[PDB]
Structures are given as structure tokens and as C-alpha cells.
Design a protein around this ligand. Sequence first.
Ligand SMILES: Nc1ncnc2c1ncn2[C@@H]1O[C@H](COP(=O)(O)OP(=O)(O)OP(O)(O)=S)[C@@H](O)[C@H]1O
Lengths: 790, 910, 49
Amino acid sequence: FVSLRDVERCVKVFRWFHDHSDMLLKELDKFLHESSDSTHTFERDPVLWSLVMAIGVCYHASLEEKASYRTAIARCFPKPYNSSRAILDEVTHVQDLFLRGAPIRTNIARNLALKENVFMMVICIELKIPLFLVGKPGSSKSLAKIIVADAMQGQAAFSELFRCLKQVHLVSFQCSPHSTPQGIISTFKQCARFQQGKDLGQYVSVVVLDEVGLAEDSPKMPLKTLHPLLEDGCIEDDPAPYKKVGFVGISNWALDPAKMNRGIFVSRGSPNEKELIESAEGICSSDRLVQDKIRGYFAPFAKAYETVCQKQDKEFFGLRDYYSLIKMVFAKAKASKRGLSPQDITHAVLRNFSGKDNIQALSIFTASLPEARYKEEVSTVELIKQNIYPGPQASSRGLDGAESRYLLVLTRNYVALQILQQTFFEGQQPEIIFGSSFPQDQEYTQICRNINRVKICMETGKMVVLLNLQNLYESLYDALNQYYVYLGGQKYVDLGLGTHRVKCRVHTAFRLIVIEEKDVVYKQFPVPLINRLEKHYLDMNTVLQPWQKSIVQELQQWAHEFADVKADQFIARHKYSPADVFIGYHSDACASVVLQAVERQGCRDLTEELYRKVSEEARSILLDCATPDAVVRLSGSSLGSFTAKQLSQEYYYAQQHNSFVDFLQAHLRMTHHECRAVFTEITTFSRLLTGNDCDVLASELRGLASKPVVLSLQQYDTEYSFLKDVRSWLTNPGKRKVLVIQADFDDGTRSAQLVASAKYTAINEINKTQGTKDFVFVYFVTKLSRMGSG
Amino acid sequence: FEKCVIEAVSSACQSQTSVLEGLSCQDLQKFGTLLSAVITKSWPVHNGEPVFDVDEIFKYLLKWPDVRQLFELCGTNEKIIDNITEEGRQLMATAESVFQKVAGELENGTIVVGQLELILEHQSQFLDIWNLNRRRDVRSLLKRRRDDLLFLKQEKRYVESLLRQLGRVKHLVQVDFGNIEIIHSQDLSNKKLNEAVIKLSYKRETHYCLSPDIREMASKLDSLKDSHIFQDFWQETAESLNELKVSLPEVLEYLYNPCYDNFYTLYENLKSGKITFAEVDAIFKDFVDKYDELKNDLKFMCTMNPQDQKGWISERVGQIKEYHTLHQAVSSAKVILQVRRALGVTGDFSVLNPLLNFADSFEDFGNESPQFIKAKQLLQDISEPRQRCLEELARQTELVAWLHKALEDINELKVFVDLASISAGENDIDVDRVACFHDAVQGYASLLYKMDERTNFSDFMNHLQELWRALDNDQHLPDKLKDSARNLEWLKTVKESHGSVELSSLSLATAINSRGVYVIEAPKDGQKISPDTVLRLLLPDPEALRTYSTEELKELLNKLMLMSGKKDHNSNTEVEKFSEVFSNMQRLVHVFIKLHCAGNMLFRTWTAKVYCCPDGGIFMNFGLELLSQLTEKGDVIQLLGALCRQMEDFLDNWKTVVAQKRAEHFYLNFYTAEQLVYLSSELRKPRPSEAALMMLSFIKGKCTVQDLVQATSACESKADRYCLREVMKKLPQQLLSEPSLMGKLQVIMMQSLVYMSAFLPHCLDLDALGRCLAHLATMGGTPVERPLPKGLQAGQPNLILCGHSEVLPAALAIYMQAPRQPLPTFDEVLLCTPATTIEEVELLLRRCLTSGSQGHKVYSLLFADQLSYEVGCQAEEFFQSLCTRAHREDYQLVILCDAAREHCYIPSTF
Amino acid sequence: RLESAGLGYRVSAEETADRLGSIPLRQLVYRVHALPPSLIPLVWDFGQL
Ligand SMILES: Nc1ncnc2c1ncn2[C@@H]1O[C@H](COP(=O)(O)OP(=O)(O)OP(O)(O)=S)[C@@H](O)[C@H]1O
């Protein structure tokens, strides 16, 4: 019910267009003379065109019945605007002019959503009237925000139109359901502090609540005090200048209309097939030959996306996946220079459309495309390899506009890490940013250091394997959108810690893998995080071939027969579990060790020669973690007496299990598998090292070791103590360094879950600190008992 | 040996190695056991024998090679099939019935075409198995069916090319596709007998192509779907119809035939070379410097009319290439005249006048213009790029005027970059502006600094040669020129900059590490003791000082956490040092506020000025006139870590000792920790505060200062005066035996734990408070007696489920069983609410099971289901704890809960 | 139109806390709370414009 409150908020907007009605008409004449024919080259009134712009901003953008409004409003205009076609082409040309005033972008659609969005937000933040955008993932609101960010700078604009306009300085606040009103009060006071002391005619700041649709019904009621903050600037003080602040309230959720009726609801609609194929044209318009080569696939992809998005009840898929499919087939058509073989289409639709269990997206996309049927099987491992290790030619031409999104793996019980640093991470290991579990650490300093490490990995250009996202979804969301700001040919994502959003450099080849569990990603992630990140499933079965499944079943029954011994030397009835004999067995370790065996083989072909040696080498790594009383008990076991003799000979002649130091002399003399960093954890039943055992180990390791240092996890309350001890160990001179990290489990202390944190911290330190000449051997010893703690 | 060899068969058939290709195995019993083994251990299990079908067994038969050898050798002799098993012969019979059904379905057309693609991919194995089935025509029948399959696949290709060609104009004119719109979308799980290779000849399919006209149309569109020129003609003649739902037979006449006529006139024009330049630069404009696709496109272009392509392709591709390089040379000449004008160099060129006099000329022929070729020998190899570099030079005139005005030479750049790197910001765009400007002017210094005002053409191209060498190392250089040219306002402010008083976000951290004094105060003002207002930080200099709060520290930490990469050790080691001393100091604030909120009264006046200086030290102080100043130098990090460790140890010891002090005194369990602190502060005064009188009136009743001074005058004897003076004597000789601070700190916290009242000579200890409250309650007699009702056990918890509307009347119904008793008070009843502290229910459990109480009372826990998960779980552990330790077995604990909310913790586990 | 505006509402209409009667304030024209009594018999309307 904005009767007689939109006209007094619209005469001011008409006055704003009428005051600036001197250069806009010259810009329109130049744009319609240099890009159109002579029919759009008529004299335009400075006041009637301003009136059409005023009614196009005040009423035409918010409505979904725009044709009825245009045919019911054109009967009052004079001769040059008698028809609705004239108003349509006029608002289209001015929106295209405001898009052309922005910096030039490649592979970005010229759809009505982007131009309409940037039109309304620019005109609404010159006039300090709040914008309240709503929509769904793929509606181009954040992409229009980042366009306004680098388009309408005051004296440094790309065009001569925005140079005469105001300067913007945006502060962001990604709202959450657990958001206090003091946060938005502090945001409004902070942007008032930016606005204080500057000229108001050439400097305006805006707040952007990027997820305001989350916090509408929190029991603390955070969005109830936004009503004065949009009108008088602040609460419990007199009205004053440098307090009224503009607002672009971008939301992915539908809002409450009663307290947001003060602004303009630019409510975005669901995409039809015409808008989808227009966006498909806009994200292929950068080239003209392969556009006309792959124009035929746009309508079947649009129909298949429509059937996929209408099939599922939960909004798991969005427009971002279809746009990424269009960009990927465009890049493959440009690089191929011959057309599109159907394996490219199947690879694109399986790399992009994935993640949901009850979705056969390949069958749906080949239902409308019967020609692109691929009868050969494709697995997840080559998809992950082609998404993490791309081709050399990709992102090598003039600027980057076509690439993939940031990968995500869907797993259970944290299994992705083993298969990631076994299979795919080749050459350079990534930096694992993770939730360090050292006691009494502060979480704020931890996430500050984590995002600093992410920024350093972005600047230096190395992969990021995140293991937490609930602490970083508010603080890393802009980098995941894969939109860049260019300054001298260098990309710039936005990073923020609370209320401090600054740009950070991005290298040419930078990947970011997120690892999360299936339950938390399916009922804890808010759902726009799903659309940004490319989904994949590599938990345990997709990499494991059926012959390796036969081998893991055979090794499970072989370990069960290894642990099964019958004897009458001692009169007792004690059944030995495979966890008793093979220490650490948890009915899942046979799959990990067959993965280790098939990668230690390295040839990967079934000619009946590789099968027996991968089976026997898997059996070797099982017996390599066997307690010696079991391997001398093996003579009366179910396996036999010649097999037991061969396994005892393997345990006592080939593998050195006598002591720690003998394992050191057996480990250093052999040249390894082209690795500058050999890691090995050790399970001990004896007492750990005291401080004089490392001295004698240096005494008979005088020619190989470099004074190994022992580290106890009891003494390390804070991460920085472990960091300074490891860093002091790296900076010592000499090669072939030895590290011994000890931890005890059978005592009153808590430190048993700190092992993984210490291991990942050691990997991060050796990745960020080691040079190119020094070999490093890190050993992790742990103390366990035979009284049930084993 | 039978069991190990069947397991070896299973392991070698589990791999993809064929077992029997060298077996001369004339003992037929063991051979039949091996045959039973290879059948039952090679059969396609799918988590353990489902088959139920025909396709997977048939794929199994065609792909694995031992099956044909199996059927050959068991069909060789009947003395081998008699001794297999009962099971293996059943599976061989099932496979043979499946193969007989399938390859007897080839004799008619009823065969599913999936099996047809399988047998044509697997020709030799199918021929072998069929020749063995022959002993219980096939070459020509397979070639006939293969020819009909290839015709079907090419007809599906023709029809699919037709749907995609008519789908690229779906916005303009829409077509009703007869019946073909459904027939084409359906899969090929369809019977082959529906594709009707009849006689008297033609071969109609389920795609009912309405004539051979649309069939030959689809063939010509399939041969011409990769011609971009044809697609251009298609869309420019299908815009000639305008919203019309149209049928397929008039699509051939209203839309296809004029397109074909235009395409055929263009073809017979291009075969001669009579085409004019207007269509040449109107159609081929998007092919500039991409001539291999155009060679392929003219090859595909002459596949329409099937004759030779020898003297037609290469001369006209070269002619169009010469035309394209001609127009590129024209645009390059216009931009080089624009940069010769805008740079101010007058010079002399005199060789590009007839090229521009040709640029406004117009001729109509397709022939090679000769006299310009030598002129264009000056501009052969510029590129289609690098003309962009000349137009950002020729369009940015304000920057080249400012560079001739303000810098004037190459040699001031090395001092200008250093003068700008101070005045630039701290974020990464602001820093990288200097390097973009530097690389821009180092890339254009060959032109903007080395030109004479009158240069000839030869040395001008000689300098553009090394300009292009400088451009070859950096493709992003004109964007660097543009992004430097849009920073002219910054470049004007740099030189005339006064002292810009903003220190930094980096050197502020160095100032904190140089003279920052972290101060914990625990303020004595009227504000609360929140963790924001206990931590301060001071920066001295002149003589002014700056006080930093916690949130300003967090904001500056966020600011300095996201700077650009200096790639030097000092910056990241000082921000790491500041961040970790701040984290350790905040950990100290956390442990100190835990010890304050637990109630300590020793560190209520504590302060600790912590210096961040190298060898700065920690200067603690107390508000006591019987203690000295504690100070110790050294490094800050591990000393604050150790100090927080003994402070946490003192927290655990203080919690344990206050637990065992609550376990001994009963009247001390009425009041919480802060009320105990208030009472210990207020009872020592000669006139105590009236809030303490009212809050102690629940114990005595009509509390009076005369009764209070009588109760506190006889609560302690004169031997404690000896004990406290012994504390004052023995400690100054004890702190001097330890030179460090940690040992004397441990000594003073032990001595405050065991003998508390000597350190604070203005407050009562918990023994004196408990004795005074016990004497006060002993003075006020006639205690309350309350029995439990009938059916209520007086030694066990009584969980009662009443319902939400009848909890509150039921409690008063319980308490009204004894008439003439006084109404209850804040003891024995807790109206539980969401967000209830664990301390109040813990003190209730201390109240109802403490031995010295001189009476029986009914203790109620109303609305006990309203507790949280953690609070209810900790209350359960606490009740189990004190029932384990020590209690009286005649307590009356009554629990009332809502009966409609039984899914929570505490009534379900009770 | 509101529940079809992009993604739906975060909470449903049955677990919504800010009710007036049986109706949420989300579906009202003005997000206003209930008038206390003795102000109900004193209100009086202006014109309808
Ligand atoms: N014209 C366009 N319209 C929509 N999405 C686009 C467009 N051009 C590119 N995109 C893709 O959309 C993403 C960037 O914009 P979006 O993130 O979809 O904006 P958004 O849909 O408003 O997201 P929200 O609502 O802020 S979470 C990238 O994955 C782009 O590849």
C-alpha cells in the first residue's frame, strides 16, 4: 500500500534523472549510432525520456505483468512514445548502456536479469533508496554487485558516465540464523564512520546483507531494528548527515514484505526456455564460429535441465550447473576444432550434473539427445583427474573467463583424504587447511590463520584441501563464486573476516577441494553452498575395481585365518580377533592396504602376473604390522606350516622388526620412489624414548642422521609451540633429517585425538618450509598396551 | 586337490585370463570337474546369483573366450557331458537355451537390435558359437542385417540432423513434426520387425518420412550441417517469414528452396570468381586469420555438387586472405596516423596517402590493388593484436601529457616508484598499482621517451620492432597501460603529498611489539565484568597515550591479517608474534574470568601489566598492604603459557576445595558464589548492608544487626589470631627462598587456599561464614516439618507426571498436607525455566542431601523437563555423584514434569 | 507469488513464532502487533483516499 508514498519517492528519482539529463542523451546517441541503424537515431526529449525512466525504475521493474502496464500507460504519452514497443526498446537501450559502462567481461550473458539488476541497484544507491533483491542461485545478483563494485568508482571509472557519478564503498555482512542485532548495528555505525569526513556529493557507502533471507525469524529478532537504520541512520541519537546509508539487500530466500515494503521488491522469476537459451547465447557470444557450431545443443540442454529441475523436490540443482555445462562444452568445442564427439558431452554432463543419489542425469540428458549415447563405462577417477589436473592449454590465452568450479567430494567417516593423497596428488602436495584440535586454542585466531593460509596459497598458486566449512562459509563465500575483478591482468576474489572485505590475488592455476560428510552436506548446508561447488562421490567403491574387491574379501578372510590359531600348549580358551594380531584392524583396513599395494605396484593392468604380486604384497603389508608372538604362534594356526614358515622368514629376514634403530639403518640406505619426504608411523608396545636414546641413536647414526629431536604432545598446549619446534628443526643444517614424534595413549591425559592434527601440521610445515636438497624422514611413534588398548 | 584346484579356477576366472588354451587333459573325470568349476565360478554373479534375463548372459557368452572352447570340447564327445555335475549341466543348459532362443530369433526379424550391435562387434566369437550350435546360412544373413542396420543408423542420423536444423529456428517458426516428435525421442529397446524391409525394394521404418523428398532433404542437411555459410543463409531466409505453427511439407517450399537457390547461385558465382567485395566482407568477416577451417569449409562446400576441387580452393582462399590483410592494413594505417597525431610528432611518412585515398574508394570486382602490395610490405607482420596497444596509446592523451609534464625522463622512475610505494595503500590492488604502472611505462619507454619530434618511417618501424619484442614478454601490457591511465588522480596526489598521518596496519603491530603494555584491570566501576572490559592495551610515545579495546584489537588483527605479500621474514614474524601474544593474553583473560565467575575473592583486586617488549616481563600487583610486587622478565610467550597453566591448576584446586567446603556446611548451600562474596564482604562491617540483612532473613527470620554481631562475635576464638600472625611471620622468609615468580606464586596460591583469611583482613572466610550462619539458625528455632503424602517414598526420588496445567496446583497440594506450617521460600523449590544455570539445581541437590539440617523438608523440582540437554545431563551426573559420596537416607525429593513432553532427558532416564 | 519467489521461506507457516492470532505476521500487509483493549473502542478511521 505505497499509494502517495511511491510518487513522493519517485518525483525525487525523476528529478535525479532530470538533473543528469545532459550527458545521458549524448551517450544514448553515440551508443545507438555506433551499434545500430538510423531508425534509433531520433531526437529525444530531456524531460519525457526522464519521465519514462522514472516510471521504469519506480513501477515497471517490480511487476511481473509488465506488458499490461506498458499497454495501459502508453495511452497518456505524446507522439514519440505512443506504443509499448518504444518504451520497451528505450528501457532496453538504457539498460544496455549501463551495462556497457561497466568493465568488459568475456563469457558473461547479456540477459535481462543482469542488466535489470545493475540498473536498479545503481539508480537506487545514487538516491539512497534500499534495494531488496530476492531470487535463486543463477539469478545474477552477486555478479551484478561485483560489477557495481569495480564499475562505479568515482574518479577511476572505466567509462565517462560513471566518472560523473558517485563513488561506492561497500561493506558486507552475510547474515546467519544465529545473528545478533548488534552485528548489523555495528555494521551501520562502521559504514557511517566511513561516510564521516568525506564529501557526500561524491562518496556514498552501502551495506550488503548477502543472506538476509536466513535471519527473518530468529528468536533474537535481528531484522526488526533495520526499519530505523534505513531511514534516520541510527537509534537513540539525533538525525545527522553521514548517517543515511544505501542498501542492496541481496537474498536467496523469499522475504517478509511488510517491513521491506519501504524499498523496491525486484522479485526475480523462474527461468523459462527462452531466457535459458538467451543466456546460452550470451555465454557463447564471445566466439562466432563455434557458437554457430554448437547452437543446436542449447534447446535440448535447456529441456533436459528443465526436466531435471522439475523432477527433484529438493532444490539440489540450479542454473549455475547448466551455465557451467555450457561453458565446458564451449571450451571443449573451442579446443577441439573439429566438433563434439559424444564422449565430450557425456563427460561434461557427468562432471557437472552429479551428487544426488536418486538422479540419473545422464539418462535424462540422453533422453532428449538420442545421438549422444556412450556405451563405454566412465568412472569418477578420471573426472576428478580432469577437474583437478586440467590441460596445459586451458586458461593460457588472453584473460580467463571459462573454467570449472571448485570441487567437492561426498564421503562418510572421513575416507576421502587417504584416496586423495594416494591417487591424484602427484608432483606437488597441497596444503591441508583443517580444524586443529589442540586444547584451549582460540577459534577466532585459528580461522584468521586459516584464511591467511588460504590467501597465501592463492597468491603462490597451490591446491587447498579444506576439511571444515562451517567455520569458513561466512568468510570464503565470494571466492567460491568464481568471478574475478581484473587489474592489470591479475584476478581478484574478495576475502573477509567479519566486516573487513578486501581483494586478494589469484594465480592462474589454483584449485580448492572441500571435503565434507554426506549427512552434514545433506541436512546442514544451507543449499546455496551446494550450487557453487561441483559435487562428486569418491568414498570407497568408485575407485575400487571388482578384482580389487575380490582381493579385499580374500585379504579379510586371510587375516581372519591368520588370527585363528588352535593350540594345546596352554590350557586356555582365548579366541584371537584380527584386531589382536594385526594391531589397528577395524574391519576396513584391508581396503586401505590393497589401495597401498596397487599403487606400490604402479603398472595397473591385469595379465594374471600383476594379480598374484599385488596379492602377495598386500599380504606383506599385513604381516608388516603383526606382533611377533603371533607370527611364532602361526605354526599351529589355520594357514598351515609351510605358509607359516614362509611368513616367519619374511617377518624375520626381509623386514626388520628388531628395534627402532635397526629400522633406521634399514630405511636410510635404500633409495626411495622419487620422493623427497618419506613418512612412516610406528606402533610400539615398549616405553617411548627418554632423551638419552636419541643421543645414542645419533652416536651410531653419525654418518646418516642429523641429530633427531623427540617431541612430546603432552607439553604442547598451543599450536605455536609445535610450529616453532618443527621450524627450528627445519632451519638446522645438514641433510637426511630424522624426526621422531612420540605420544602416549594409556594414561590420564586427553591427547589421543591430537595425532591427526600433529600429522597434518607436520605435512603443512614440510610443504611450506622444505627446500629442494634436503631429504626428510618423519617417524611417528605411539605407545600402546597389550591389556586391551591395542 | 579338487577343492584347491576349483579355488584356483575361481581365482584365475575372477581375473580376466583365459584358463584353457593348452590343456591336453584326457582324464575326463578331473576335466569334467574343471568344466563344472569354470562354469560355476565364471558365471556373472551380481552380489550372488541373480540373472533372470537374456542380455547379460549373452554378453558373457560373446566376450569371455573360454565359453566357446567349453562348448566345442563338450560337443566334441558325449563322454564328457555325462560327468560334470547336476548344477553345472543345468547352467550350461540354461546358457544353451538362451543362445538358441536369441540366435533362432535372427532367422526372423524379431531380434532386439542390442544383441545385433553385440554380435557385429563380436563377429568371430558369434560365428564360432553358431558353428558349434550348427551341429546341435549365416555369412550372407549377417551382411544383409548389417547393411540394414547401417541404413537404419544413417537414417537416424539424417532425421536427427533435420530436427537440430529445424530446432535452431524454433523461436521464429514452429513445426508440428508429424508423428516423428515421439518416435525420435524413444529409445532403441524396440523390435527390429517394426522396420519393415518389405519387397515389391523400399524399406519403410517407424520414422514415417512422409516422402523421399524430406528424406533427401535430411540427407543434404546432414552433409551440410557443418557449413557456417549455409547456416547463415538458413537463418537469413527463415527470418523472411515474420508465430506460425506450420506442417512439414511446406517447410520444404517456403523455407528450404529459396535457401537452396541462394546457396546454389553463390556456389556457381564462386566457381568463376565474379563475386563482388560487398558479400565478401559481409559474410566472411568472422574468419580473419583462421584459414584452416576455411579450407575445410570450401572442401565441405564443394561436397554439395560432387566434382573435383583442384584449382578452386587455394587461389580464392589466398585472395580473401589478401583482402583481409588489406583491410587490416587500412585499420592499422588509421590507428598509426591517430597515434602519430596524438603523440605530437609531426615527422614525415608520405607513403600511406593512397591507401587512405583507397579507403574511401569503392570498387566492385573480386580480382586482386597491385600497387598497394609493396606499400603493404611495410605492414606485413604487425598482427591482428598489438593494434590494440596502439589504440590505447592513441586514446590516452591526458596521461602522456601528464608524463611529459611531471616526470620528463627515465631516470626519475626509480625514485618515483619508491615514493609511491609509501603513499599507496596496504591492500593488494593498492600495492599492485605501482607495479602495473612500472611495467606499463617500462614497456612504453621506447616510444614515450625516445622519440624525436621529427622522425622518419624507417626508424619508427625500427622502434616498433623492439616495442613488439617488449610486448612479447607481457601480453597484459595495454591493460596495464589503461589501468595506470585511470589512476591519474592518485598519480597527481603522490608528489604533492604532505605527511599522510596513517601509520599503518603493519607498523602499528611493530609499535605494539615495541611498547605495548597489555593491562588486565578487572574494573572497579559500575560496569559488568564482561571479557571486553577487563582487557586493555596502551601505547605511549611526545607524551600522549592511546588505549586500545578488545574489539579494536580484533578489527586491526583482521586488517593486518589480509595485507599483500611482502615476501620478507620480518613482516610475517612480527604479525605472528603479535597474533600469538594476543591469543595467549586472551587465553589469560578467559582463565581469569572463569576464576572470577567461579568466585575467588583473592583475584578480585588482581592486575597484571604485561609488557610485549623484547625481554619486557610481567608486572603483577595486588590490592593488599601485606604483599609485595611480583615481577619477572624473560620472553612473553612461554611465560604466559606457564602462568595460564598454574592459573588453570589453581582453578581446579579452588573448585575442588569449594566443593568440599559446600559438602561440610549446609547453610552455605543456600547462596551462590557471588552472594557468598557479598556476604563475606558485608558481615565484617559494623553496620552491614540492608540487602544482606534481607537476604539473610530467610535463615533466621526477622534478622537484626544485634543478633548478627552476636553470631559473628562468638564464631572464632583467639587461636586463629596466633595462626594468622604465624602466616604473617613465615611467608616473607619463604618467598625469598625462590628467586623466580612461579614458585612463589604457587606458594601464595597454596597459602590462600588453605589459610584464606590472613591475606584479606576485611572479609570472613567460609568457615567463619558457615559458623555464623549455623549460629544464626540455631538462635532462630522451631524448624518446619513436612511429611510426604500417601504412596510417596521418603528415601527415593519421587518423579510425578502431572501435565502442564496441573503442575503448579499439585505442588501446593503436596505442601498443604501439614497445616499451620509457614510458606516455602527460595530453598526447596525451583521453578525451572529454559536457560537455567547448573549452579542453582546443583545447590538444590546440595540442600536436600546435606546431613546437618535439624528438620525434614519437602524439596521440589518443578517443571524439571524444561531443562536443556547439557544442564539435565550434568544434573543427573551431579545427583549420581552426591548419592555416591555421602548423604542421608530420609530425604524427600519430589520431581514434577509435564506428561506431554516426555522425549527429553531427565524424566526419561529417571 | 511469495512462496514461489526464488527459493521458499526458511521456516514454514506452522513453526513460525511471530503470530497474531492463528496467522503469522509474515502474511499481513503491516507487521503490527495486537492492539491492547480500551484502544479498540477508541480508534476511528479517516477517509479511504
Ligand atoms: N548472466 C548470468 N546470470 C546468471 N549467472 C551467471 C551469469 N553469467 C555467469 N553466471 C554464473 O553465475 C555465477 C555467478 O553469479 P551467481 O552466483 O549465480 O549470482 P547469484 O545467483 O545471485 O548467487 P547468489 O544469489 O548471490 S548466492 C558463476 O558461477 C557464473 O558462471
